[PDB]
Amino acid sequence: VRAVVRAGIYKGCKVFCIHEGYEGLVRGGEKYIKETQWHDVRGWLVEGG
Amino acid sequence: EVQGGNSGYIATHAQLACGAQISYVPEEGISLAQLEMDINSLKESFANDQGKTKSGRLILKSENASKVLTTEVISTIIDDEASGRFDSKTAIPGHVQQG
Amino acid sequence: EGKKKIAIITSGGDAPGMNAAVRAVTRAGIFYGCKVYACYEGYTGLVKGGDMLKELQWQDVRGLLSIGGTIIGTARCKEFRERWGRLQAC
Amino acid sequence: SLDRICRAIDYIDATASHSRAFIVEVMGRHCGWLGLLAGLATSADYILI
Amino acid sequence: RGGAPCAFDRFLATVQGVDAVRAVLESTPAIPSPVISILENKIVRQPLV
Amino acid sequence: DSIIRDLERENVGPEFGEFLNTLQTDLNSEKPPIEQVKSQLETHFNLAHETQEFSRKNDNAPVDKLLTNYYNNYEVNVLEFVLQMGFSRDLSIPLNVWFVLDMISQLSTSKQDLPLDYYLVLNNSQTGKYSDFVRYLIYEAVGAEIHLANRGPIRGNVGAGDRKITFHLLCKKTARMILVGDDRETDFEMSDRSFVTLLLDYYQRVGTTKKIDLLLLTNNFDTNMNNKLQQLKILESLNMLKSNCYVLDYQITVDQVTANFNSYVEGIPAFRRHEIANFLKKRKTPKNADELIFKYVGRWNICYQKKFHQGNISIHQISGYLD
Amino acid sequence: YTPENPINLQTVQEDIELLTRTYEEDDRSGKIFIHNEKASKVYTTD
Amino acid sequence: LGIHKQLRFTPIRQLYDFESDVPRRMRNIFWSNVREISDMLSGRTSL
């Protein structure tokens, strides 16, 4: 996810993180579909799950 | 300080896996111009940390990247140039990396 | 000739530092946008001024601060004691 | 002693000029070794030993 | 008269030499022809006359 | 008085000294000296048409109120380290000076402001010989009768808020004095390429650690050395611009350098990454390797944001830094 | 090199540039740098 | 015996004579793209 957020940002496009996978995709809204920034995926390499 | 000798393979991959800001490799070497540019990057990086996650900063330096600009020398230059805005410390594990 | 032509002469008895003086005159002259000309063997070179008047380059005065006496060379005031000698020097 | 002599000759050589001759009066009553060796070391024109 | 100039002479000739060039540039017929001199450790332009 | 001699020695028009002789300031009145000089300028040099056309040829862009219209009273009165990167070749020197006074007055409305430091760089020869003229007018606009210097910064109070200003004119002459240690003779040739590195050398020696918050960019003379884009890529490289710095690029005539500028500054990280990268193979040659433009290349990871654009006059603000 | 004047990556690069530009003209030679023992705890004589 | 893009056996002759810094260096790299990406992800500016 860190890679997708940064790569997409670098290639000049808005990246949205769909929280709770398909549930988030079906329910929709700002609640599950949040716009993600470059600094928002900081140190995610170490993070598990 | 990174192992692997004249091969920059391990520092390249460790930079990707750890999220290091820079990796100094034997194939490229370390120029004073790049060192100054990279230090100014750090200066700006810390000036922009105001508000974001504090994840920490790494520079990976393969021992063979420079015989003159060594891990210890590089770090002292960072402190000199940082002008109290941040500090630099070395991490030299040694030829124990075998595992 | 676009620039200013400054002539440097070392005349009289030798004195250690004459070379340092020549090096400072030359290099400062060049820096300020002039052409520095050496006048060889004191006033004699100024009186018989032809091949005796040669230009000095920034590199010509290398290491002169540890040399002495003079690389321009010196000569006794003799023909420059007479008016016709000073006329020719002019 | 030979060193003292050569030190003087060296200083004499360290200058410019026509119509100039220089005399180095050397101590050494019986032998001409000092005169000869100074003459050799400093490539003197003429030695009186 | 021979040999390398001493510490002070190296300074004195280099400093007076630079000023000599300056004195040339800084000239006009109204300003008299000088002698680059030294007084209280200060380089001074005394009149040649 | 001593300045009027400098311009006649420089083969300049008497129109300048004639102005310095009629230049009066009644600092006892209600109108601030900045506007007294500003008014005097506009009426001695009849820049009426030049100010009108400068706007007209930029699609009625308010040149008089650029900062003013855009920012709120707070935003514009918070900007404290302004750095003007020379004059516009397209504008006359009297209009150029007027524009600096107008800018200064645009940053000094409120009497509830912190001090301001204004840096005006006269980067080429064609403008550099107007430094003392500029300085003398500044000396009067700020009214440095509070507590002029041959080499030094002008300190006064300015505008309608009598805001403390501390103005500094950086030029080849002040630079020439600095190097020869205030010695009388300074007539040695100084490259414009040499002037940037020396301006860099002073900031490094003074240990100055204040960030540029408003940058004035333009089309100077000697564009081979004093280019608009490269000028920015050096302040970007050296970490001299604030975290949210403003960049204003006023001009009239349109060049590739203006098109290359806007493309870089408005481009995506991948476009900037590559922009820098190309220039490097395309221009870095063994003979040219030493140059300041192959040491301080810019930062692709810096993110700008468009805030204004009214025909060839635009404002951009540093919105981010990717790391 | 003196304590009165700052020593850094830019100053050092400039010093190298001078030395480089000086040597690429030479054809008596041999150049020197004067380093004051107490000038920088970083950029030492060594 | 080696991994190439394929698990292949390469005769020592071609790798020693042509593919190696036989000398004191003991080592042309493949990881160039990995390098570009890690500089991209960290905002590094090269020269």
UniProtKB/Swiss-Prot annotation, chain B:
Positions contributing to beta-D-fructose 2,6-bisphosphate 2 binding: 3-5, 63, 95-98
Intracellular or extracellular location(s): Cytoplasm
Superkingdom of source: Eukaryota
Binding site for beta-D-fructose 2,6-bisphosphate 1: 89
Stretches of the chain forming a coiled coil according to its record: none
Assembly notes: Heterododecamer of 4 alpha, 4 beta and 4 gamma chains.
UniProt family annotation: Belongs to the phosphofructokinase type A (PFKA) family. ATP-dependent PFK group I subfamily. Eukaryotic two domain clade 'E' sub-subfamily.
Its biological purpose: Catalyzes the phosphorylation of D-fructose 6-phosphate to fructose 1,6-bisphosphate by ATP, the first committing step of glycolysis.
Name of the protein described by the UniProt record: ATP-dependent 6-phosphofructokinase subunit beta
Species of origin: Komagataella pastoris
Portion of the full sequence shown: 744 to 842 of 941
Swiss-Prot record, chain E:
Source organism superkingdom: Eukaryota
Transmembrane segments: none
Compartments where located: Cytoplasm
Quaternary structure, from the entry: Heterododecamer of 4 alpha, 4 beta and 4 gamma chains.
Entry function: Catalyzes the phosphorylation of D-fructose 6-phosphate to fructose 1,6-bisphosphate by ATP, the first committing step of glycolysis.
Protein family according to the UniProt entry: Belongs to the phosphofructokinase type A (PFKA) family. ATP-dependent PFK group I subfamily. Eukaryotic two domain clade 'E' sub-subfamily.
Protein's name according to its UniProt entry: ATP-dependent 6-phosphofructokinase subunit alpha
Protein species of origin: Komagataella pastoris
Curated annotation (Swiss-Prot), chain F:
Lineage: superkingdom: Eukaryota
Key words of the record: Cytoplasm, Glycolysis
Annotated pathway: Carbohydrate degradation; glycolysis; D-glyceraldehyde 3-phosphate and glycerone phosphate from D-glucose: step 3/4
GO cellular component: cytoplasm
Matching CDD domains: PpPFK_gamma (cd11687)
InterPro entries membership: PpPFK_gamma, PpPFK_gamma_sf
One GO term of the biological process aspect: glycolytic process
Subcellular location: Cytoplasm
Keyword Cytoplasm: yes
Pfam families, sorted: PpPFK_gamma-like_C
Statement: the UniProt record of this protein carries the keyword Disulfide bond: no
Further facts: This subunit is only found in some Pichia species.
Self-association and partners: Heterododecamer of 4 alpha, 4 beta and 4 gamma chains. The gamma chain bridges the N-terminal halves of the alpha and beta subunits.
Role: Structural subunit of pyrophosphate--fructose 6-phosphate 1-phosphotransferase. Not required for catalytic activity. Fine-tunes allosteric regulation of the ATP-PFK by ATP, fructose 2,6-bisphosphate and AMP.
Name the record gives this protein: ATP-dependent 6-phosphofructokinase subunit gamma
Species per Swiss-Prot/TrEMBL record: Komagataella pastoris
Gene coding for it: PFK3
